[PDB]
Structures are given as structure tokens and as C-alpha cells.
Design an enzyme around this catalytic site. Structure first.
Site, PDB file in Angstrom:
ATOM      1  N   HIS A   1       0.757  -1.400  -0.331  1.00  0.00           N
ATOM      2  CA  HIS A   1       0.142   0.220   0.066  1.00  0.00           C
ATOM      3  C   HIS A   1       1.060   0.847  -0.181  1.00  0.00           C
ATOM      4  O   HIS A   1       1.970   1.216   0.653  1.00  0.00           O
ATOM      5  CB  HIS A   1      -0.299   0.188   1.411  1.00  0.00           C
ATOM      6  CG  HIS A   1      -2.116  -0.826   1.284  1.00  0.00           C
ATOM      7  ND1 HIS A   1      -1.490  -1.665   2.975  1.00  0.00           N
ATOM      8  CD2 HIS A   1      -2.854  -1.001   0.981  1.00  0.00           C
ATOM      9  CE1 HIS A   1      -2.948  -2.694   2.659  1.00  0.00           C
ATOM     10  NE2 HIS A   1      -3.382  -2.203   1.690  1.00  0.00           N
TER      11      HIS A   1
ATOM     12  N   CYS B   1      -2.242   0.488  10.265  1.00  0.00           N
ATOM     13  CA  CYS B   1      -3.475  -0.803   9.675  1.00  0.00           C
ATOM     14  C   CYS B   1      -3.935  -1.005  10.883  1.00  0.00           C
ATOM     15  O   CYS B   1      -5.376  -1.370  11.076  1.00  0.00           O
ATOM     16  CB  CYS B   1      -2.174  -1.237   9.712  1.00  0.00           C
ATOM     17  SG  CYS B   1      -1.220  -1.019   8.699  1.00  0.00           S
TER      18      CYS B   1
HETATM   19  O1  LIG Z   1      -1.033  -1.605   6.483  1.00  0.00           O
HETATM   20  C1  LIG Z   1      -1.691  -1.973   6.806  1.00  0.00           C
HETATM   21  N1  LIG Z   1      -3.219  -0.655   5.871  1.00  0.00           N
HETATM   22  N2  LIG Z   1      -2.794  -2.582   6.337  1.00  0.00           N
HETATM   23  C2  LIG Z   1      -2.050  -3.548   6.415  1.00  0.00           C
HETATM   24  C3  LIG Z   1      -2.829  -5.635   5.808  1.00  0.00           C
HETATM   25  C4  LIG Z   1      -1.752  -6.664   5.664  1.00  0.00           C
HETATM   26  C5  LIG Z   1      -2.984  -8.077   5.696  1.00  0.00           C
HETATM   27  N3  LIG Z   1      -2.247  -8.988   6.382  1.00  0.00           N
HETATM   28  C6  LIG Z   1      -3.141  -7.847   4.551  1.00  0.00           C
HETATM   29  O2  LIG Z   1      -4.951  -7.069   3.732  1.00  0.00           O
HETATM   30  O3  LIG Z   1      -2.544  -8.510   3.777  1.00  0.00           O
END
Ligand SMILES: */O=C(\[N])[N][C][C][C][C]([N])C([O])=O
EC number: 3.5.3.18
Length: 271
Positions: A163, A264
Site C-alpha cells: 500500500h 493499519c
Molecule cells: O497496513 C495496512 N493498512 N494494512 C495491512 C494489511 C495486511 C494484511 N495481512 C493483508 O491485507 O494482506
């Protein structure tokens, strides 16, 4: 007044997170008990220490990634955008967030468009505008539904870690914390080119450590949760120069193995 919050929405981590949560690379085994201690400390900071009213959602064993509440909602002033996560298996996390956000009396917009995806992790709100990362989780259509939802603010896309915020976040008003990698620097250049307003930068040598939480707290002032000297000694030295910020070191070494960082695990709401 940028960074004001009154409420945080969080979600407990399920046991299933250790083996079953999605992760971009092979890594060390997750110590789930330590992840849990770490998540409890992060919640203690937001809620106990800073006086946010915290809404703690229950863990759901069938949603191993449910701890990462940032991906399922973007909140700006009085409007919540309930997202459609780019990971199809995460889509069900949306139900509990929606109900929590309704109880906080937000206006709710739901991303339902079956061709739109967006993770809240791909979303950087600067106080003036939105930057939205186009990644494997966030597409064009998702970014447009976001634009159509927050009509008061400019929205711009940047091609993308997992992201956008894997390597940046706001560290203050007008201050973008940013990593030093080729990727982080190419993205920042694009963001800077697309906006008239001039942002200041806080450049850290560790991309992951550029993910921090900034808050502006009445009677406290500038507050910044950042990764610890033990995890990222060379980035913490950078944050340490912020003499007007209350600096709070928070570990997330365990959640880091499944790609989670500081931002997150909460949705910050001003009410
Ligand atoms: O950092 C953010 N906003 N989200 C992390 C999500 C990690 C999770 N293991 C996935 O969605 O793959």
C-alpha cells in the site's frame, strides 16, 4: 486543525492470525501471544494514554486479518467510506466496521461496486487532500468512488509495498513522513508534482518506519507514535529530532510479519 481525533475504532486479533493472515513474503513464525501483547499496548496508548474513546471490536477466527481495521474504512470529518478490500477474503470484515461507524453517528457510504476495490492502507489524507495509491488492492474505480464520496477534497492517484502507506504517513501538519527507497521516493515525487501545496518531508532510512500515527491532542499538542529504536534505530533517530512532538515509541514487530504497521490497526475519528 489537522490530526484532531476523539475516537478510535480497533479490532482484536484472532488466534488464526499467526498461521492464516495474508503476508507478502515468507518470514519468521508469528508469536501470536506477543502480537497480542503488542496490540494491547497500542490500544493502551490510543485509549488510556491519549484519552481517545476506543471502540474495541471482537476478533473473528475466520477473518485472520480483521485486526487491520484501516483497510475497511476511510473516515473524513462526519463521513465514513466503508471500503471494498482488494483481498476478497477480507470483504466480510466490513460488516462489523459498518455497525460500529453507524453507532458513532457517521454518514456511511458503502463501496458496493463489484468492479471497485480499495484498501484504506492505500489512502493518505494530508489535511488538504487525498492521495490514493493504485496497487494490487486499490484500483482506479475504487479511487473514483473515494473522490465522489469526499467531495470537499481533491483526490489524486499515485502508482504503488502493499500500500501507499507501507512507506509514508503524516507526521504532523504539512509534514509527510517518507521512506528512502527508490519506490518511496518515486511516489513522493509524483505526489509532490500533482499538488500545488508545498509539503514538508520527514525522510527516514527505513520505509516501514515512515508509517507513524500523528495526533493533535487538546492539552497535549503534537503527538507521534513511531517505531522503536529496537526495531528501527536509524529511523527513530530521525523522529527524535521532533522536539515539539510528544514521541511515543510503539512496537509492532509481530504484526509486521503479516505486513501491518502503525496506522493499519485503528480508524481515527473526530466527533
Ligand atoms: O497496513 C495496512 N493498512 N494494512 C495491512 C494489511 C495486511 C494484511 N495481512 C493483508 O491485507 O494482506
Amino acid at each position: 486543525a489537522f490530526g484532531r481525533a476523539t475516537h478510535a475504532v480497533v479490532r482484536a486479533l484472532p488466534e488464526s492470525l499467526g498461521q492464516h493472515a495474508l503476508r507478502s513474503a515468507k518470514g519468521e513464525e508469528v508469536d501470536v501471544a506477543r502480537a497480542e501483547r503488542q496490540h494491547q499496548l497500542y490500544v493502551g496508548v490510543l485509549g488510556s494514554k491519549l484519552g481517545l474513546q476506543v471502540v474495541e471490536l471482537p476478533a473473528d477466527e475466520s477473518l485472520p486479518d480483521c485486526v487491520f481495521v484501516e483497510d475497511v474504512a476511510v473516515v473524513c470529518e462526519e463521513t465514513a467510506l466503508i471500503t471494498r478490500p482488494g483481498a476478497p477474503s477480507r470483504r466480510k470484515e466490513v460488516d462489523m466496521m459498518k455497525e460500529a461507524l453507524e453507532k458513532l453517528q457517521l454518514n456511511i457510504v458503502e463501496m458496493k461496486d463489484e468492479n471497485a476495490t480499495l484498501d484504506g492502507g492505500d489512502v493518505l489524507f494530508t489535511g488538504r487532500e487525498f492521495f490514493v495509491g493504485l496497487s494490487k488492492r486499490t484500483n482506479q474505480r475504487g479511487a473514483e468512488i473515494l473522490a465522489d464520496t469526499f467531495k470537499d477534497y481533491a483526490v489524486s492517484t499515485v502508482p504503488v509495498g502493499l500500500h501507499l502507506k507501507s512507506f509514508c504517513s503524516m507526521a504532523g501538519p504539512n509534514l509527510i513522513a517518507i521512506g528512502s527507497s527508490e519506490s518511496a521516493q518515486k511516489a513522493l515525487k509524483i505526489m509532490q508534482q500533482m499538488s500545488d501545496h508545498r509539503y514538508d518531508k520527514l525522510t527516514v532510512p527505513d520505509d516501514i518506519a515512515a508509517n507513524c500515527i500523528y495526533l493533535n491532542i487538546p492539552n497535549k499538542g503534537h503527538v507521534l507514535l513511531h517505531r522503536t529504536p529496537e526495531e528501527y534505530p536509524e529511523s527513530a533517530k530521525v523522529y527524535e529530532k521532533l522536539k515539539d512532538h510528544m514521541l511515543i515509541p510503539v512496537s509492532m514487530s509481530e504484526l509486521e510479519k503479516v505486513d501491518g504497521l502503525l496506522t493499519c490497526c485503528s480508524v481515527l475519528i473526530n466527533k
